[model samples]
Target: SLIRKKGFYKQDVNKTAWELPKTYVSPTHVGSGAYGSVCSAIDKRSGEKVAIKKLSRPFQSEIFAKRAYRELLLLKHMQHENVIGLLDVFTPASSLRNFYDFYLVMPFMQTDLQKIMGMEFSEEKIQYLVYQMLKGLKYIHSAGVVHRDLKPGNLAVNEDCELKILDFVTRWYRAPEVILSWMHYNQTVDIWSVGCIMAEMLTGKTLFKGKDYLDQLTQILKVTGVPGTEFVQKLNDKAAKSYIQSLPQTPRKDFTQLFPRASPQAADLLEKMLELDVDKRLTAAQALTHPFFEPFRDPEEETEAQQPFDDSLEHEKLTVDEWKQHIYKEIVNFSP
Candidate 1:
């Protein structure tokens, strides 16, 4: 069965994480970022433990609070181990200057991928990690949410190495031009960032390092190939003339050459993921079932089970091997 959030976890933007009726002990700071600092906290009332993300001054405005509220709305409704569970949120009185110092309480982890990936890991460990990320994306995108910023810092893993994806920052990076043209935010914009995260996982470094947007786009195109005619046409219509003209076309098929050692399954998956055209990019739902994952499966069972063979095995609808192979193929062939 899918995991479900505890009914007690609440989302209230007007309050702060520290203000919950649940007693929050003095914070032991864990980490801080451009958005806020995260501190360890214990809920004395229900004995519910959580991590409190204390928003830094200046980063919190009415706009920021509302955005945080939206994040909670998404996280609370979305159930997946890869996503950090939002246990509760608290905002202070509007009059308090410290109101901006709001906190968001969530589940705590013993460590994160930023720490684990710091050391050399085995191939199986890496596969396990990537599989978790993909599963998170599969659930989030199915629920129609984009993670926006999918960098290593936002990915957390507990003592058991269970992974969770966190944070909702730099959402602008995911905004497509159509929505940007209308000057409204679109949730699907994060697909590009997900691709970047996938790239980083492969090489263990910033895949598209750049000082600015153009530079980042340049880096993206360098490996992914130039944008296609359709994407180029769309950009020219909505983007600045000089910027549009300077951009190169990127091909979806170019990725195979970039990761020569990657199994065909991995490479096939990446091609659609890093497509130059955002419109052509594969969403999480589409990816989880792609054929590129075939190499990891037992070939005999996969080929046999996919051919509409007998469904009876020990009076069950399908055998374990049959079910797994069928699921693999279904993922590969699923349509939105």
Candidate 2:
């Protein structure tokens, strides 16, 4: 094979391999995880900043490969103003055997919401940012797509206050069902996260700080209050039913009391989002119409997906090698 290490750049042995084009240069380490690492670089074509991430041995197993595959699909399709979009996807190595890494190039936002949450935010600024969040999320769920992991760290902003979703998991902002059920999710899953995010923006701290999985539910129930047995009775498993039954009774904390600094209207929206019942949660679409966003709502500006996402492939069981083939196919076909 003509391709070798010279074709790629490695700033550190610990980081992932980056084989981007010559125009995308001056790579700076941003953040990383087991999946891979990310770097900030400038696109010479337009002098725009971009974030290029490397997939770490995605073919090692079907699960990792599946995540990498879905990311490509999501980034390529995300066209909304607040949703993160991909500018390019490529690999330096040409041979299939040598195709261990795929570089994803997308806009490099200045700061994640995680950092800004701690700063002083004006009512107007919060109003506009929340509008952007709901608008982008509506577009995502409009197509039957659910952002499985939504957190402040995954949400970014620039000096202009433009917000974009960066990425997450069933963590601090996780819905009750996600913690209770083994494997179940819907668009409502994202609704729960939006609530936690709003609450965080209001208070400058995470709503639930669970010590563990069970502790998380314990903490969430404390504020949301214990569910009535009538609702608990409908649980899929007796384990969940009993878990609810076992929790000591508590009343839903008054939103005003929870957020002493928040307006009644703002707190009202927060209450609806954190509802324990999945059916009662406020949707991203309907959230736009709430009086809390009266200043920013624009009926004509909100948009939806032309076609709902086809998640049939997520369930189609494929071997590691086959998953690799699907990923390879997309990488080769992707145009810069």
Candidate 3:
């Protein structure tokens, strides 16, 4: 009877709903951030390289949960080629009650502006890249979002020289209003960042490399001069008294002298963008119309101008519970 057993048998196997094995393969370690570890993975079906981000216990804190929700919400609704695409999302656990991990699948971009720093860039390339960043920012601002952080690391680029501004991420390129912890900020915060990026590209160095926030403020003042009381009063009284009033007044530097190699058009745009008065700073839409970008701007670009996102949507506030529930649903319903 034992000798007669010669045939083999197979059994059907079922995978857990959250399991990633069948959908993705060959995950290569990419990088890690404050909230999660990211890896580049090959999609079994599409065969595209996607960046998979695993949130580190996102449900443990309200801040992390809301950030996750906001990031997902923006990625889902923001439809533009310059913006990063949300390919898919998944979790290892089933229901929200049992959920433990969250994953965001995005297009795997191997190069960011950080990697390209120190390399010589042609004026045309610089203008085009900056134009692309503004285009992406225009879309983001129109969607009621302010990229709280904008810097070389967050701006992603490809071989074709296409650029995309990553959102809500950096300090070196932080706007004065943001650095002072002003209660309210708008799209102008992002313009300051663009100015910093443009300067870095032209000079091959960071415009301000302050050791800390206070030092950063000093560095900014050294270049643009101390802002008037009207501008200082915009910050909290304590911050204004402690920082601006205590510092000696400084004269503004000539943009051309600061960037000796830059053209008048470029210098003019930089001055407008880096204006100390938030009200004077150039808006993303306005920056696009600047003459520095004239060589690359097409008629269609102006025709396609967009309005800022609705004020009501931009200022909407939500509770931790609300954000968690919303994020949970987004994760469950995400499609590749």
* CA lDDT of every candidate: 0.54, 0.80, 0.74
Q: lDDT of candidate 1 vs native? A: 0.54
Model 2: CA > 4 A from native: 4-17, 168-170, 182-185, 239-249
* C-alpha root-mean-square deviation, each candidate: 14.8, 2.9, 7.1
**TM-scores for all predictions:** 0.63, 0.88, 0.80
- Candidate 2: Cα lDDT at 60: 81
Runs off by more than 4 Å, candidate 3: 1-21, 96-98, 167-170, 181-184, 228-250, 299-325
User: Candidate 3, residues 255-287: lDDT per residue as tens digits?
Assistant: 999988888898999999998787878888899
Clashing residue pairs found in predicted model 3: 149-169
Tens digits of per-residue lDDT for model 1 on 1-336?
212212223333323333333366645667656666677767787675578775555233445444444444455555556677666665442323223344566888878766665354544555566656666766666565556666676788887778887774133234334323523334334555555555555666656666655565566557766554455565544554346456654444555577655656666666666665556677655555666443332222111111221222213343333433432332233231
Backbone clashes in model 1: 15
lDDT of 2 by residue, 72-141 (tens): 8888877788899888888776677887768788888889888878664666777888888889889988
Q: Highest TM-score, which number?
A: 2
Better of 2 and 3 by TM-score: 2
